[model samples]
Every structure is written in structure tokens, then in C-alpha cells.
Target chain A: SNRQRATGLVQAYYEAFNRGDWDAMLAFLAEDVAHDLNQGPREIGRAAFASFLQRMNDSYREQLRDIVVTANDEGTRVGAEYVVHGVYHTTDEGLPDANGQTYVLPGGAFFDVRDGQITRVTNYYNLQEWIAQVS
Target chain B: SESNRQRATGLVQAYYEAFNRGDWDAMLAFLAEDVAHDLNQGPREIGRAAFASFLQRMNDSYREQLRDIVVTANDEGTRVGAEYVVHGVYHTTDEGLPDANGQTYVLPGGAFFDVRDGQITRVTNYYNLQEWIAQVSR
Candidate 1:
């Protein structure tokens, strides 16, 4: 039951992401969720996550394909593997210039869920691949 | 089923420990004879011996350790995935990436694995190439 619920919860979050439903995505997170950016710092709380999502939506238009979500037997931890097929709409600070350059980037994330809500979301991707595509 | 997941997690961690210790023999012991190793940005090398050869090449150019590894497995334990940070020195030069003069780098990486019959059958590693290039170039 736990594993099923965890899998469903995580899948729903990503599905909402694809649907561009930020509010639905935010509803899946715990109040004090911890977010780890790839090669970056940890930002905490639901409001912080909402802010992060806003910035992400502004910078890139991405869709995940070929998703494979795995949950541990205990259902406390989950991993998602997917390919991000998207366009870099604008530039992030100190990074490569983005002008609607599309890139296919392999990405994954680890999630911690408890009490029917996700507690932590840690994302991973090859920044070099992004740079290679945009450059 | 839970036990299977536990076993797979243990096997992968042991593999990681063997690598960290530079014990090539131990590292090769956990793989099937026809193990498939998908190199980061390279070929899909197969067989235990071939895997060993690849490791030898890596050892020739890099001295590294995987730190803070977070490992998990599917409920069936048919697969395992890991994320970690690599801290290492580019001690020697490798082809294409020229002239390593002991440049140290901190890079993040992830891996996916398929395990069967208590041995690893597939290992797909992912890392940022340009990140390493940037680190070693400077």
C-alpha cells in the first residue's frame, strides 16, 4: 500500500509538472519540503518550492519522456529517470545564452515521501550536456 | 521482495566500496561474466575482463572517490540507482582530454544498474563531461 501510494504521488507530481499545473504540483509537497537543485544549494519550504518552480517555468519549456519511476519496498524513497526534451527560452545568470535552443537531456531525481506528501525532492542532470546543446 | 531490494542495495554498496578501495578484483567479483557496463559518454563495454580493462584505464588517469552516495532499489530489486559526488585528481592525461597535471575536481554523477542472480548485469553511468573539462582545464 505504501509503495503504491508513493509511486502514485510521485507520478502525479511529474504529471502536474507536464500539465503546467504549478498549484497541483505544489499541493503534493509537504509544508516544509526540502528541495535540492542539481549542483546547487538546498531550499526549504513549500513557498520556496513555488518560487523555484516559477523561475524554472520562466527559463525553460521542458517535457519529460520515457519516465521510469521506482520506489523502494518501504516506499519512503523513490527515484525517477527520464529524458528532458525541451527548449531553453531565456538565460540564467552566469550560464550560456538561451534563445529557444532545444536539447535532449537525461535527468533523474530522488524523492522522499511520508504521510502522503513528498518531503524532499533532489534533482540531477548533466549541466555540461545542457551547455553543449545551447552552445 | 523487500529482501531482494535489500540484497541489491547491499551488492551495489559493496561494489562502490570495492571501487573506493581500488580493489579491482573485488570490484569485478560482483559482476556477471557478461556484465554490460555503459561508460559515461562512451561505449557499452561487456564482460568482466573488459570491465576490468576499462577500470585499469580509469585508474591510469584518475584517482577518485565517490562521496555521499545515496542508493535505492526498486521493490523487486531488479534495479538499483545511485547518486554521488566525485572528488578526485586528474593525475595523468587521457586521450581527447589532454594533459592532466593533478587537477582536482568536484563533480556530481548518477548511475543505474540491473542486477540478476545476485550479480550485476548492467551498469549505466551518467556524468557531465563539460563539467569535468571545465574543472581540469583550469
Candidate 2:
């Protein structure tokens, strides 16, 4: 049942992303959440870090093409692999927006879940290709 | 029962052996019914049928060898951690565009499996994608 709960929570989190349910998204995150992208430093706290998701929605119109999610009662670790398809609209970092550029990039994440909420999320993806798509 | 634990380990071992031997059918038998294998991208394979398709695709593209495999278990001998170095030789190309020639990649990954009722319910893996990409592209 724990594995099912973990699996359900992961799917719900992704579903919320697809639906643009920011409120529901926030509800799934732990208050003291830690976020780390492979390219940068880790950011802490859910309230403070929710802006990243906002920026994500504002910047790109993306769809998850193929997503595979799995979890276990090992309790804390949850993993997902998916392909993201999107157009570049807004610019962030050094990458300039090409506006209508479309690319499909494969990505994965390792989630640290606790108390039925995501306490930490480590994003694993290709930064070069990602920047290239937006550039 | 020791038999149940052994069977669980055997299943896990069989998966590795099948993968190394490029025996896709044997590999599929070890997986759960609702296996979600997302090692890469294309389509989300939901059940055994989809998983088998994915495995076949993998077998077609790459020949993998386990450099070393170390399995750890709990007091009851339930597998907790499996650390292995998978060396792959790229044969075909995918969207990620792996090297076309025989490329050497050392993927230091570990699998965490949850064994219950003598079946593996879930298996989660950890490895650095960038490391693999860099090695293959090199």
C-alpha cells in the first residue's frame, strides 16, 4: 500500500503539472523542500522555490511525451524518466529564446519523498541541448 | 522461507544475465506485470508487452556487459542494494544520438528493489546521465 501511495503521489504530481494546477502542485510539496537542478546549487524551502515552477510555466509551453514513474517502500527515493517537448518562448540564464523552436529532450528525476510529500527533488537533464533548444 | 528469498535474488540475477547475454525474452520473465522501464525516452511502456518491446529495442541498439555486480541484502537476505558497472557498446543510433561505433561507457548504477510476497514490486535506479553522455560522446 505504501508503494501504491508513493506511485500515486508521483503520478498526481505529474498530472498536476500537465493540468497547470499550481495550487495542487504546491500542496504536494513539503514545506521544507529542497530543489536541485544538475547545473546549479540546491534551493531550499517550498514557498520560496515555487517561483521556479511559475517561471517554468511562463517560459515554455511543453508536453511530457513519454513518462515512466516507479517507486518502492525503500520509502524516500522515487524515480521518473520522461521526454519533454516544448517551444522556447522566454529567455533565462545565457540562453536566448528562439520563440518557436521545438525539441524533444529526455530527462529524469530522483525525488526524496516524506510524509506523502516531496521533500527534495534532484533534476537530471541535458543542459547543453536544453540551452540549444531555447537558443 | 529461504526459497522465497533465493527466488527473489534469482529473479534479479536472471535479469542481469539475460541483459548481458542479450536474451530479451529471459529478461522479460523477471519483470513485474506492471513494469515501468524508463531508462530513456520514446514511449511509456505500461505493461509487460510494452516492456518487452522496450527491451527488444535496447537489445537491438547496444551490447551491455556487467563489469562487476555486488548485491547486498538485509538480515533476512532480501536484496536491498545492487551496485554494478555496466559497460555498453553502442551498435545503433537513437534520438539522443549515441556514438555509432563501439563506444565504452561505464555506468555506475545501483538498483533498489522491494521484494514482497516473493515478487519484486518496484525497482528504482540511480546514475548520472551526464556521465554516460560524456563518456559515449567522447
Candidate 3:
């Protein structure tokens, strides 16, 4: 039998993200959660993860769409095909967005949950596709 | 007597081997009678006839070799997570579309499969579509 309680934990995280409720979002994460994008450095803790989110909010006006949530025996998986529509103002970690160009990224995240918190999140998306317009 | 878990693993292994060898018949044997095959680019295909069309297109499109294949079975063995790579040659007219011909591309992806009664009922694949488009479009 599928646990209905698990779905609530999964949905809370999604709602928090959609609402831009950073504090509520942080509450749903484990202390040493593994947040990896698989192409760059991974944030191994809640603080590092929150810092990354802050940078994103400060740098770009973002919108996420087609947010679909599914759960299975392993955990919950969230698929959000999103677009960041705004001027890229500053350089993020040595990666420049000088031209103030708007870009879109279609991405998905696989979340592993334990004890009502996200333990690991594997972010999957195409960075090259997002930067193609700039180049 | 073989359990459902062992059967699921066997199906995963057989599917990979068949795909690597480009053996359409052998591959279809592992699918359920009403198997729903969903590639990222399109909707799902049901039944053997439709799946044959699907497999034929796959066989013609890319000449592929599997690098590493891994299958994770759940405790009940009904759920599966399979990952593999295809160092594929982009051949003529891939996936029902015209291709440049003689282009080589690498495709690394994983799949979450649901099995029932020793046959795969559903398969959802996770792959980098942008990578494929970039390499093939070049």
C-alpha cells in the first residue's frame, strides 16, 4: 500500500517552492541533504542549498511550469519543465550573464525522502540548451 | 520456482542485450502483451504490432553498444531502476526523421520500469534529450 503521509511531505516541498517560501522549503530538507545538479559542485547541507536558492532569486526572475509530482517505492520524483524569463544581470560563480538575456531551462528533479524530509535530490536538466542563445 | 524479482532482473538484462544486439524479436519477447512503451519524444505505444513498429524504427536509426548496464530491484521485485549507456552511431534517417548519416553520438540514460507477472508493463526513461539534439544536429 502507498503511504498517503509520504505524499504530503512531497507536496509540501513543491508548494513551498512554488510559493517562494524559502523558510518553509528549508524546513522540508534534511540537515545534510545531497543536492546535486550532476555537472557542477553539489551542496551537501541546508545552508549551502539555501545560499544557492538565494542567489537564484536575487539574480533571475524565475517561473516554473508543468510541475508534475509522482511517488514510488524509492521516493518521490518531481518533473518541472521550467523557464527563467529575465535579464541575466551578474556573473554567477564565474559564469557570466552579462548581456541581460532571458533564457529557459527544462529540468526535472528526483527526490529521495526519509522521515518526512528530502535526503537527496538529483537535478537533471540541460545547461547547454539554456546557454545556447547566449553563445 | 523462479520469483517475480528474478524474472524482472532477467527481463532487464535480456532487454539490454537485445537492444545492444539490435534483435527486435528477442526484445519484444520480454514485453508484456499490452506493454506500453514510452520514449521521451512521444506518447506510449501498446501491443506487439505497435511495438514492432517502434523496434523497427529503433533498429534502423542508431547502431549502438551498451557500455554499462545496472538494474536495481525493489524488495518486492515489482519495481525496477535500470541504467545504461549507448555509444551510438547516428545512422541514416534516425527515429523516422532524416539524419546527416554516419554521425556518432553517445546516449546515457536510465529507466524506471514496472513489471507484472514476469513481463514489463511500463517503462519511463530518463535521458538528456538536449545532448542528443546537440550531437545529432551538428
Candidate 4:
């Protein structure tokens, strides 16, 4: 039952994300959710996560495809692998300047679930590869 | 069901053991001929030859070992995940990166696997490139 719940929750979260339904997506996170950015520092709380999403939305438009979600029997942890198809709409501070550069890269995320909510989200992607594609 | 999960876990465990021993050929034995390799933050390359070349490049550039490996497999045993810490020293200069001066670094990494018929059909690896850069640059 825990495994089913966790898997369903993760699938629902990604579904909301793909639909650009931020509110629905945020509902899946715990209040004190921890967000570990790809190649960056970790930030906590739902508010911080919202801000992070806002920043990401401002710079990039992306979709995840070929996603495969997996979870252990204990259901405490989950992992996902996907290909990210994205366009660089604007440049994030200290990163490459963006002029509508498109990138297709492999990426993945690991999650910690507790109390039926996502407590931690750690993402990983190739920063240098993206730069090369966009530059 | 139990047997498949154990088989998947065992396959991954042996793969890591071979890796830690720096036995690339032994590691490759566990992979399918058409294994799909998801390079860290890079393209998804297919086949054992590409995997071997990638291993050769990595071995040439760094001396590394994985520690604290924790592997988990789904009930179906087709999907597996591993979490570990990499203890590595940059030995040779890798193109498009900083000059290597035997800089040692520690980093957290993970991998996802798709196994079938007792061989790994796909492997996707993840690590923070920025974190690695900061460590070696410092």
C-alpha cells in the first residue's frame, strides 16, 4: 500500500508539472519540503520551492519524456529517469546568455517521501552539456 | 518474484564490486550488448563498445572508487537504483575542464538500471558536475 501510494504520488506530481499546474504540483510537497537543485545548493520549505519554480519558469520551457519511475518496496524512496527537452528562453544569472537555444539531455531525480508527501527532491543534469548545446 | 529481485540486486552488486576493483572487463560482462548508457548529464549512448570507450576515458582521466553503495530493486526486479559516494582523484587532464594535478574530490552519486535476463540493459548515472568542479578547482 505504501509503495502504491508513493508511486502514485510521484506520478501525479509529474503529471501536474507537465500540465504546468504549479498549485497541484505544490500540493504534493510537505510544508518543509527540501529542494536540492541540480548542481546547486539545497533550499527548504514550500515557499522556497515555489520561488525556485518561478525562477526556472522564467528562464526555461521544458518537458520530460521517456520517463521511468521506480520505487523500493519500503516506499520511502523513489527515483526517476527521463529525457529533458527544453528551450532556453532567458539566461539565469552567471550562466550562459540565452537566445532561444534548445537542448535535449538525459536527466534524473531522486525523492524522499514521508507521510504521503514528498519531503525531499534532488535533481541531476549535465550543466556543461547544456552550455555546449546552447552556446 | 523474490528470486528476480535478488538476481537484479546481485547483478548490480557484482557490477559495483568489479568497478571498485577497477576491472572494467568484468563489469562489462554484466551488461547487455546493446546496453544503453546515460552519461552523467550527457547524451544516452548505446552498446557495450561505447560503454567500454567511456570507461576507458574515465579510467584514463581519474582514479576513482565507489563507497557506501546502497542498492535497491523494485518488486518486478526490472528497475534498480544505487546511491553511493565517489572517492576520486583527478589524474589526467580531461578536455573542457580544469587541469588535473592529482586533485582529490568526494561527491555523492546515484545510478538507475534497467535489467533483463540477468544483464543490465540500461544504466543512467547522476552526479553534480558543478560540485565536482568546485572541489577539483579548490
Candidate 5:
């Protein structure tokens, strides 16, 4: 079933994230994947996604905990809710300085899957809360 | 099992519809008395009274319409999620934030819902607060 397949795919994607395995995570994406990040414009293609991940790797170290995934019968649309426990490692432009500040944030995401690979990824979280903690 | 999922999505659908209509009481009717509401990443606020207060505060500070709402649920209808956009106007001031001069903004939002006895037992909402501030700030 496609539903079961997507459940397994996103599960593996998160597993790769927890392991900090960029190659494994990139393998789970479609060639023309659409990255829908909150407060930012939509990024198209896998290369853009990889660069975004690389940028985050330079600035912050995050681990998601208590992940719960929900899916529809078709499995084309899936959602996940989790708590992000992260440390601000380096400062980014137009933001406060970072010096190993730990922050806990609740986050969620919805994914669009097709042909066993994720075609679209939408992420949601509160940017202000994270800034407050890191500052 | 699909029927159970339908029931769950229907609950969330009706909740959003009521919100669109500014029907606060009707929306409250869909929440359990002990409904756990987490507004942001900050604190855990529970019960219908707390939820009502938060709703009133938002209603006072801004006027919003939820657009392109999508709801998804598991087979058992115990867990649900909604992704949507808010087309809103910041009409009044909110504490510790920039003064509002009637700026309109578009923002993406999401929420996870825990369902029991046909009512929402828990709803955790997320959005980009910094984006909202940046959009409305002078």
C-alpha cells in the first residue's frame, strides 16, 4: 500500500536526520522535490534542499523527539509532530549571536509523497520562540 | 477504519469553519473542557476557559481568515493534523510587539489534534511568529 510505504519512507528520513546522514536523507527525496519552509519562499529541486540542510548544519544542531506521524488512507499526504531539542552553534546574519544556547521547540511538518519518494516537504515552527531562547 | 478517519477530519473541518465565521461559542463546543491548547512553543495552557481567553485576545488584536485548509488523520481517528494559511490584518496592538497600523499579512500555520469522544482533547499550534512581526512592522 502507498500509505504504508510513505509511512516507512518518512520514518527512514527522520531516522537519517537523527543520524546526521545527509546522503541517506537526500536519497529519500525526489529529483524535483519542493521544499516548503515556513517564512521562506518555496525551494525547488533536490540541490536546493541539500544546500538548505547544509546551511542549517553550519548554524544549529537539532534533534527531534517524541515524533508522531499521521497519514491519510492514500498515504500521499502525511504529517508529523515532534519536539525539537537543539543547540545554537553559530550565529546567522540578521539574528542574535549564538554561543551553545539550548532551546526546546514544538514543531510539525506535512509531506507530499509520490512514487515512494517525497515530492514536497512543508515544515512549521515558531521562529520567535526559538530566537527568544537562543538570545 | 476509513469511516473513523472521516469523522476525525469532519470534526476539524467544522472547527475551522466556525472560526472563519467568527463563531467563538460554536468553536468552543467542539473542544473538550480539558482540551490542552499549546499556542506556541512557550507554555501548556489547558481547559476551555483558557482556550476561550486566548481566542478572545486574538480576536481583539487581529482579524483573520483561514484559507486553503487541509486536514489529515490516522485510520483510528485518534490523531489529526491541519495545515493552512492565515490572511489577516493586524488592527490593534499586542503586548511587547510592534504597534499595529492595520497591516495585512499572509502566514502559514499548522496544528496537531488529539481526538477523543468526538471532541478535540489536545491541539498544538505552530506558526512563524518572527515572520508575522516582520510583515507587520514598520
Candidate 6:
């Protein structure tokens, strides 16, 4: 069923992410994928997504834990909530300086699945809480 | 089955409508007696009474409205989610934050709901606190 497929797809995506397998993760996204960066602008296309992933890897390391994925009957939409355990190894532009700071924060993401691939992903997290923990 | 989806979506819709209308009592009425509130970046607050106080504190400290509200629900009518932008003014001081001087800010926020028997049993909210701090501090 599509509902089972959708939930399994998201689960695989996160599993790849946890393993730092960017290529495997990208393989699950559509070519014209739309990504809504947490508290930032939207980026489109698989190339842009790859670049974003590269940038994130360069600056920080993160793992999602305690993930719970839910989906509707139609399976076109899915939502996930998790705790992000991260370490800031490098500084990111327009934000606080990073000196290998560690932070654990609650986060969630919403996804749109089409044709067996993720077409859109929107992530949300508390940036201020991260700053408080690291700064 | 379609009716269940509608009912779930409708419950979420009504909750937001109550929020938009500043009808706190109506909003509270939709929640379960043992409602669980997952505060953004904070500890969980349980029970309708605690939820009421949270609303009172929020109302006292901020004057806000939710705009661009978009809600969705699962097939079984057990879960719901909403995304919106909050246009708010800091009217009074909130603990552990900068002093409030009526600073206006716009922030993106989202919430997830667990509904049972037509009442919300859990509400988990998320937003960028750093963005709000910068907006207000500036």
C-alpha cells in the first residue's frame, strides 16, 4: 500500500541521514525536490539540495533520534518529529560562532511524497534554544 | 471514513478559528481535560488548568494573531498538523528573555495535535526563538 511505502521511504531517508550517506538520502528525493530550510528560504532541485547537504556537513554533524513518522491514508503527505543531537564543528554565516559546541534540540519535518519519492520537505526547529545551549 | 477526516480537519480548523478570534474559552473547550502541552524548547505542561494558565500568561505578555494558517490531518482522525505565521507584539516581559517594550515580530510556527474523541489530547509546537529574539532586539 502507498501508506506503508510512504512511511518506509521516510524511514529510509532518515536512516541514510544517520549514516551520513548523503547520496543514499538524495536518491530518495525527486529531481525537482523542494526543500524548506529551517527558518530560512526555500530551495529547489536536487543539485541545490546536494549543495545544502554539503554545507551542512561542512559545518555541523547531526543525528536524528526518537523519530516518529506518521502519514495519512492517501500517503501523499507525511510528518515526522525527532530530537536532533548535533555538534557545531564550524561557523555558519550570519549566525553565532561555533567552537565545536554540542546541542540537543527537538525538531520536526513535513514531507510531500509523489511517485514514490519525496517532492518536498519542510523542517522546523528552535534556533534560539540551540543558541542558548551552545552560547 | 471521509467524514472522519473532515471531522479531524474541522476540529483543527475550529481550534485555529478560536485562536484568531481571541476566544480562549472556546479554544480551551476543544482540549481534553488531561491535555498535554509541549512548549517550544521547554518542559511539557499537562492538564487543562495548566494549559489555561499558559494561555493566560501568553495573553498577558503578548498580543498576537496567527496568519496564513494551513492545516492537515491523518486518515484515522487521530493526528493533525498546522503551519502558520504569527504576527505578534511583545506587550509584557516573559521570563528569561529580553525585556519587552512592545516590539513587533513575525515568525513562522507549526503545531502537531493528537485528537481523541473530538478533543485535543496533545499539542506540540515549534518555532525559531532565535529569529524572534533578533527581530525584537533590533
For each candidate, what's the DockQ?
Answer: 0.25, 0.05, 0.08, 0.47, 0.49, 0.29
Error of 4 at A29 (Å): 2.5
Candidates' lDDT values, in order?
A: 0.85, 0.66, 0.66, 0.87, 0.87, 0.86
Residue-wise C-alpha lDDT for candidate 6, range A67-123, written one tens digit per residue: 877666678778887899999888887668888899898788888899989999889
Q: Evaluate residue B98 in candidate 1 and report its C-alpha lDDT on the 0 to 100 scale.
A: 67
lDDT of candidate 6 over B13-126, digit per residue (tens): 899999989899999999999899988867789999998899999998999999977666666778777777899999899988889999999987888888898999999998
lDDT at position A51, candidate 4? 88
Quote the positional error of residue A122 for candidate 4 in Å. Answer: 1.3
Top candidate on DockQ is 5
Q: Give the per-residue lDDT digits (tens) of candidate 3, residues A56-85.
A: 877555556645443443444322223344
lDDT of 5 at B137: 84
- TM-scores, one per candidate: 0.71, 0.53, 0.56, 0.82, 0.83, 0.72
Q: For residues A103-129, write the lDDT of model 4, one tens digit per residue.
A: 998778888899889999888877778
- Tell me, by TM-score, which candidate is best: 5
Worst 10 residues of 2 chain B by lDDT: B36-45
After superposition, candidate 2 runs with Cα above 4 Å error: B1-138
The chain A TM-scores for the candidates, taken one by one, are 0.94, 0.89, 0.77, 0.93, 0.96, 0.95
Candidate 3 stretches with Cα past 4 Å from truth are A1-135, B1-4, B95-98
Query: What TM-score number comes out for model 1?
Result: 0.71
lDDT of 2 by residue, B16-69 (tens): 777778787776667678665544212334667877776677777877788576
Tens digit per residue, CA lDDT, model 2, A18-83: 787878877888988887755555788876667887877676777775666554445455666668
Task: Give me the TM-scores of chain B across the candidates.
Answer: 0.97, 0.78, 0.88, 0.98, 0.97, 0.97
| Candidate 1, residue A15: how far the Cα is off, in Å | 0.9
Q: What is the lDDT of residue B92 in candidate 4?
A: 98
Across B10-101, the per-residue lDDT of candidate 4 in tens digits comes to 99989999999999999899999989998786788999999999999999999999998877777788988887899999999998899999
lDDT of 6: 0.86
